[PDB]
Paper text:
Following from this, 3D-structure determination in the presence of the transition-state analogue confirms the role of conformational flexibility in the generation of a new function, as transition-state binding is shown to rely on conformational rearrangements. Specifically, the bound transition-state analogue is displaced with respect to the position originally occupied by the tryptophan 229, as required by the presence of an aspartate residue at position 229 in the active variants. We subsequently performed MD simulations in the presence of the transition-state analogue 5(6)-nitrobenzotriazole (TSA) to explore the impact of transition-state binding on the conformational dynamics, as well as how well each system could accommodate the transition state in its new active site. The W229D variants of the ancestral scaffolds that give rise to substantial Kemp elimination activity (PNCA, GNCAMP and GNCA4) can accept the TSA in the MD simulations, although the TSA dissociates from the less active W229D variant of the PNCA scaffold after about 50 ns.
Here, we explore and test these notions using resurrected Precambrian β-lactamases11 as scaffolds for the engineering of completely new active sites. Of these systems, resurrected Precambrian β-lactamases have been thoroughly characterized in terms of their structure, function and stability. These putative ancestral proteins have been shown to be highly stable and able to efficiently degrade several antibiotics. A hydrophobic-to-ionizable amino acid replacement generates a buried (or partially buried) residue with the perturbed properties that are useful in catalysis and conformational flexibility assists the generation of a completely new active site by facilitating substrate and transition-state binding. We have shown that, when using resurrected Precambrian β-lactamases as scaffolds for protein engineering, a minimalist design approach based on this mechanism leads to levels of catalysis for the Kemp elimination reaction of up to approximately seven orders of magnitude above the rate of the uncatalysed reaction, as well as to significant ester hydrolysis activity.
Residue numbers in the entry: 27 to 58, 60 to 238, 240 to 252, 254 to 294
């Protein structure tokens, strides 16, 4: 209730459309602002993509140490890791790490190819119970973020529930689960979004995303000391303020989420 008004005030000053979901795993209870509205995912999809790959590894259809070869012509804009390994190539695990930790666009496209494309990612999501999130396009076309376009979107609540089952539930094997946590925890943003609003003593594994039509997102599983973990998803789009302002918007969601856990009662 109170956090809602605070977020709606924050949404006004952003000029855009803000969506937040908070899933407390101690109770399975969730708080949500536009939690059942569609928002463009941009790079936050890469957390799901590495999950779907690890699920192939669990099934035996993939190996984290499989070498993937690619040439200069497979590269798209923003490939900080993969661009320096056109010769060697990279293992699946190295592409997953590059995609989560640095948002390497070629890594994600290479992992989508190994998977079977946006439809295979969407198909995996369905198999774990997410009936909402959808990936339709490849990098970088999927960062369009056009209002009313349902392609490449999720909801704050759907994304939060999906992170819960992948990182904390029984969707992946325990080892794949631990591996996906390890990748998300070693973000190198790093960091100015949710991370910036939170207590430093927290262990945070997060994924950021940026797009057109004034879009910045951040999703995260947070482990507070001596406390069950909490899943926070934040989606901002149609924002009229600039990229640095959008970062501070997301950090302010983080601060408000903490205040409401400690004080609203
Ligand atoms: O992100 N959080 O929802 C959250 C809530 C309460 C907390 N106490 N410590 N860290 C926290 C994070």
């Amino acid at each position: 209730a109170q956090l809602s008004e605070q977020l709606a005030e924050l949404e006004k000053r952003s000029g855009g459309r803000l969506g937040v979901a908070v899933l407390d795993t101690a109770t399975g209870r969730r708080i949500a602002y536009r939690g059942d509205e569609r928002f463009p995912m941009c790079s936050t999809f890469k957390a799901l993509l590495a999950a779907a790959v690890l699920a192939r590894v669990d099934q035996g259809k993939e190996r984290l140490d499989r070498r993937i070869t690619y040439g200069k012509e497979d590269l798209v804009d923003y490939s900080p890791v993969t661009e320096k390994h056109v010769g060697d190539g990279m293992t699946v695990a190295e592409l997953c790490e590059a995609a989560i930790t640095l948002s390497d666009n070629t890594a994600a496209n290479l992992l989508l190819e190994a998977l079977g494309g946006p439809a295979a990612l969407t198909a995996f999501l369905r198999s774990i119970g997410d009936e909402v999130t959808r990936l339709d396009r490849w990098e970088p076309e999927l960062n369009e973020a056009a209002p009313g376009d349902p392609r490449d979107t999720t909801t704050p609540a759907a994304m939060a529930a999906t992170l819960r089952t992948l990182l904390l539930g029984d969707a992946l094997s325990p080892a794949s689960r631990q591996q996906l946590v390890d990748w998300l925890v070693a973000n190198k943003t790093g960091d100015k979004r949710l991370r910036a609003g939170l207590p430093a003593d927290d262990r945070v594994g997060d994924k950021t995303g940026t797009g057109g039509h004034g879009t910045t997102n951040d999703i995260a599983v947070i482990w507070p000391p001596g406390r069950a973990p909490i899943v926070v998803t934040v989606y901002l789009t149609e924002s009229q303020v600039d990229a640095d302002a959008r970062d501070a918007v997301i950090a302010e969601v983080g601060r408000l989420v903490v205040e409401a856990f400690h004080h609203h009662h």
